[PDB]
Design an enzyme around this catalytic site. Sequence first.
Site, PDB file in Angstrom:
ATOM      1  N   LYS B 112     139.655  -1.433 -20.792  1.00 56.06           N
ATOM      2  CA  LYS B 112     138.704  -0.725 -21.644  1.00 56.06           C
ATOM      3  C   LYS B 112     139.416   0.102 -22.710  1.00 56.06           C
ATOM      4  O   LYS B 112     138.910   0.244 -23.831  1.00 56.06           O
ATOM      5  CB  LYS B 112     137.801   0.155 -20.771  1.00 56.06           C
ATOM      6  N   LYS B 195     137.222 -13.954 -11.991  1.00 54.03           N
ATOM      7  CA  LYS B 195     136.673 -13.369 -10.772  1.00 54.03           C
ATOM      8  C   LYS B 195     135.174 -13.124 -10.905  1.00 54.03           C
ATOM      9  O   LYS B 195     134.716 -12.540 -11.891  1.00 54.03           O
ATOM     10  CB  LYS B 195     137.413 -12.068 -10.463  1.00 54.03           C
ATOM     11  N   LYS B 198     129.755  -8.818 -11.373  1.00 48.53           N
ATOM     12  CA  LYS B 198     128.397  -8.566 -11.842  1.00 48.53           C
ATOM     13  C   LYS B 198     128.323  -8.524 -13.366  1.00 48.53           C
ATOM     14  O   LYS B 198     127.280  -8.845 -13.947  1.00 48.53           O
ATOM     15  CB  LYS B 198     127.897  -7.261 -11.225  1.00 48.53           C
TER      16      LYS B 198
HETATM   17  N1  LIG Z   1     134.974 -11.782  -6.864  1.00 45.67           N
HETATM   18  C1  LIG Z   1     135.229 -11.081  -5.763  1.00 45.67           C
HETATM   19  N2  LIG Z   1     135.774 -11.713  -4.696  1.00 45.67           N
HETATM   20  C2  LIG Z   1     136.028 -11.001  -3.590  1.00 45.67           C
HETATM   21  N3  LIG Z   1     135.822  -9.709  -3.354  1.00 45.67           N
HETATM   22  C3  LIG Z   1     135.283  -9.112  -4.428  1.00 45.67           C
HETATM   23  C4  LIG Z   1     134.965  -9.703  -5.632  1.00 45.67           C
HETATM   24  N4  LIG Z   1     134.424  -8.762  -6.500  1.00 45.67           N
HETATM   25  C5  LIG Z   1     134.426  -7.639  -5.817  1.00 45.67           C
HETATM   26  N5  LIG Z   1     134.937  -7.794  -4.551  1.00 45.67           N
HETATM   27  C6  LIG Z   1     135.092  -6.774  -3.521  1.00 45.67           C
HETATM   28  O1  LIG Z   1     133.826  -6.217  -3.256  1.00 45.67           O
HETATM   29  C7  LIG Z   1     133.965  -4.816  -2.904  1.00 45.67           C
HETATM   30  C8  LIG Z   1     133.055  -3.992  -3.781  1.00 45.67           C
HETATM   31  O2  LIG Z   1     133.595  -3.943  -5.125  1.00 45.67           O
HETATM   32  P1  LIG Z   1     132.647  -3.434  -6.315  1.00 45.67           P
HETATM   33  O3  LIG Z   1     131.555  -2.587  -5.749  1.00 45.67           O
HETATM   34  O4  LIG Z   1     133.489  -2.864  -7.409  1.00 45.67           O
HETATM   35  O5  LIG Z   1     132.016  -4.820  -6.818  1.00 45.67           O
HETATM   36  P2  LIG Z   1     132.249  -5.701  -8.134  1.00 45.67           P
HETATM   37  O6  LIG Z   1     131.842  -7.108  -7.847  1.00 45.67           O
HETATM   38  O7  LIG Z   1     133.618  -5.421  -8.661  1.00 45.67           O
HETATM   39  O8  LIG Z   1     131.174  -5.049  -9.127  1.00 45.67           O
HETATM   40  P3  LIG Z   1     131.321  -4.247 -10.520  1.00 45.67           P
HETATM   41  O9  LIG Z   1     131.335  -5.297 -11.604  1.00 45.67           O
HETATM   42  O10 LIG Z   1     130.119  -3.338 -10.605  1.00 45.67           O
HETATM   43  O11 LIG Z   1     132.621  -3.487 -10.427  1.00 45.67           O
HETATM   44  C9  LIG Z   1     135.465  -4.503  -3.009  1.00 45.67           C
HETATM   45  O12 LIG Z   1     136.094  -4.561  -1.735  1.00 45.67           O
HETATM   46  C10 LIG Z   1     135.979  -5.606  -3.938  1.00 45.67           C
HETATM   47  O13 LIG Z   1     137.347  -5.893  -3.744  1.00 45.67           O
HETATM   48 MG   LIG Z   2     134.593  -3.401  -9.273  1.00 42.82          MG
END
Ligand SMILES: Nc1ncnc2c1ncn2[C@@H]1O[C@H](COP(=O)(O)OP(=O)(O)OP(=O)(O)O)[C@@H](O)[C@H]1O
Ligand SMILES: [Mg+2]
Lengths: 330, 330
Positions: B112, B195, B198
């Site tokens: 960012k 990856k 969201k």
């Molecule tokens: N693509 C993915 N594969 C595996 N684990 C994931 C992935 N994305 C997030 N995680 C895991 O999910 C958990 C929650 O992470 P987090 O709440 O930041 O979700 P996020 O998918 O990164 O969402 P955001 O985009 O809002 O950051 C963490 O343990 C993170 O490592």
């Molecule tokens: Mg995250």
Amino acid sequence: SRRIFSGVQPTSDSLHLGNALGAVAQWVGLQDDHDAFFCVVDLHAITIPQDPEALRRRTLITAAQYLALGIDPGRATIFVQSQVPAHTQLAWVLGCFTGFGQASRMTQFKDKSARQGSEATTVGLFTYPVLQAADVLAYDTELVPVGEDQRQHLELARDVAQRFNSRFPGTLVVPDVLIPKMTAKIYDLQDPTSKMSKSAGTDAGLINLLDDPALSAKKIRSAVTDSERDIRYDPDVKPGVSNLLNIQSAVTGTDIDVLVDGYAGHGYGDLKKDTAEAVVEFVNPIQARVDELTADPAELEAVLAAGAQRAHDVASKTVQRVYDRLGFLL
Amino acid sequence: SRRIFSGVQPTSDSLHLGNALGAVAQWVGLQDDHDAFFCVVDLHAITIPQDPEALRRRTLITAAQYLALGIDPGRATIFVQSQVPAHTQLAWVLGCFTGFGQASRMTQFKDKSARQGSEATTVGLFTYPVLQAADVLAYDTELVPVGEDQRQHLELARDVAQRFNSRFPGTLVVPDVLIPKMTAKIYDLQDPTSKMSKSAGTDAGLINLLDDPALSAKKIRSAVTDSERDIRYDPDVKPGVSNLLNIQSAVTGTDIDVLVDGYAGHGYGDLKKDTAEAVVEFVNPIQARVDELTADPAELEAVLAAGAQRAHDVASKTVQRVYDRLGFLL
Ligand SMILES: Nc1ncnc2c1ncn2[C@@H]1O[C@H](COP(=O)(O)OP(=O)(O)OP(=O)(O)O)[C@@H](O)[C@H]1O
Ligand SMILES: [Mg+2]
Ligand SMILES: Nc1ncnc2c1ncn2[C@@H]1O[C@H](COP(=O)(O)OP(=O)(O)OP(=O)(O)O)[C@@H](O)[C@H]1O
Ligand SMILES: CNC1=NC(=O)[C@H]([C@H](C)c2c[nH]c3ccccc23)O1
Ligand SMILES: CNC1=NC(=O)[C@H]([C@H](C)c2c[nH]c3ccccc23)O1
Ligand SMILES: [Mg+2]
């Protein structure tokens, strides 16, 4: 109401004249017709490594110097910052509304981040202006009495409050800054164009409240003046002399202009002795009060315990208001 | 004991397969023989502007997806981060022991702070790795089950804990990181070497738990594969195909190697339909549980209320321990 908030770090075993005249004197004048929260901000102290035994002792002796300077626990709330969790709760929220570049333009930060730009700066040393904003905004503060060295920090607090209220109207009180004129900056006695700070290297220009009064009077005598033999008030031209008259005016009650015309014909030597006697007469009532407060601590303890109870009841309502606006599950 | 802590942000109306398989599946396996704190970290959500109505609703639906995925409120503690003030209390302390340069080397921040280096970064977006450290360290956590994207953050937590313990031995538990291998990273279906997040722009490669199961099955069918017609597991060479088998293995229980030899002679089309059916069979029990938890919220409310009570009793003892070591007046 006219709600007031202000704070001093417990970073040394004594306040100096800058703290007492540039800040606490203004508080004593305000407390009787303002609703006042006076804080020993011990969370700010640990931005620098702190000895645990000293930090606890200096916290108590900072609150004791408040009372010794006239803060009245019947008219005002004195408490210790770390005992009210809302400060850090609000500071996290406010940091989310604070620009990174806005926080990096703060002067303190560019000083320490000058010689070791990333090598010696911590996150706390970078973010404490945001915790200072939360200190004020948690109490719906209308006015903040500080010296000039806090002005930039409190403009940050006001801006973040307006930015927050822009999203969520009417949540936070935007506080007015109240900085004096005469006592806005008490200068070092060995260096008349630099600010009396606890971190001055040599304390020969530093006047500590709880120091031995004859030593403080010895330092006043050694004050750097000029070579014009004329006693008058011109801080840009006469930094030393204007400092001493500013000090004498503050510890006595006599206006500077009245002092100056009384000093017509007088020399700098008599200006120094006169200031030294007024200060010695000023610090001696304080040292006697602190000594009783230190020796018998149930009184002080209890003031701080009532103070933190009252501060928590106010500050936690503010946090709950902010949290509800943000949309947190309560 | 074997104390565990982990957290997910309430930043959307549904977890996706990366969250469920890369994180929550590992939690369900751990909760029965580990003392587990599972947190909806809503304070982290507000590092980005958040709609208040959505943020409250997504907080509840994140905790509901925890239960829908098998988290058991009799075996584990689920709570909302903002309801436990110790998190922010510890984060302030830990920021005082965190290097500025150490926090600016964090990858999220350099992303960012790349296009708008100081123009769009906030303090919260710079310091949230320090609040993540406090989330873990407040519960004397021994082990943290996360996906690979959290590894750099938790090395920061471990380093700051050791630095703190260096000054004050034995205060904080240094936690071990527990990252899986197969499910360490569930990738996007339209972009096999990126990856599943969201914030992916187009959700045509994103598989949301609470999405309409036929739509998620339609996206699985549209998954980017290769052109070798050979079904095997080689993520460096075969990013798409290895993703799909990784997903099918995770939602079923069948090892990848067993799946691969069963897919001898089969084409990518049958690998997609087979994955799509396993996922549809996976999400349908979850959606039915979430729908009951959303429609009838006294159950969920009460789990979160017991959870925050228990989390506060633990986390506030840690803060009081840290504060006493620091030398704060208690
Ligand atoms: N693509 C993915 N594969 C595996 N684990 C994931 C992935 N994305 C997030 N995680 C895991 O999910 C958990 C929650 O992470 P987090 O709440 O930041 O979700 P996020 O998918 O990164 O969402 P955001 O985009 O809002 O950051 C963490 O343990 C993170 O490592
Ligand atoms: Mg995250
Ligand atoms: N030289 C000074 N003259 C006037 N007011 C001062 C002076 N130094 C500090 N103050 C005021 O005293 C109050 C307490 O400030 P603070 O606790 O930071 O003290 P300090 O003297 O700056 O000590 P430190 O070196 O630990 O920062 C503030 O309102 C500040 O503006
Ligand atoms: C290192 N922290 C720090 N230095 C300062 O000068 C400020 C002061 C001590 C401060 C913190 N909170 C306040 C609230 C009102 C007025 C001053 C302060 O903080
Ligand atoms: C924006 N904040 C943030 N993003 C992340 O990936 C982490 C996660 C959500 C997190 C916060 N606290 C935790 C404790 C344990 C495991 C993950 C997290 O924080
Ligand atoms: Mg200061």
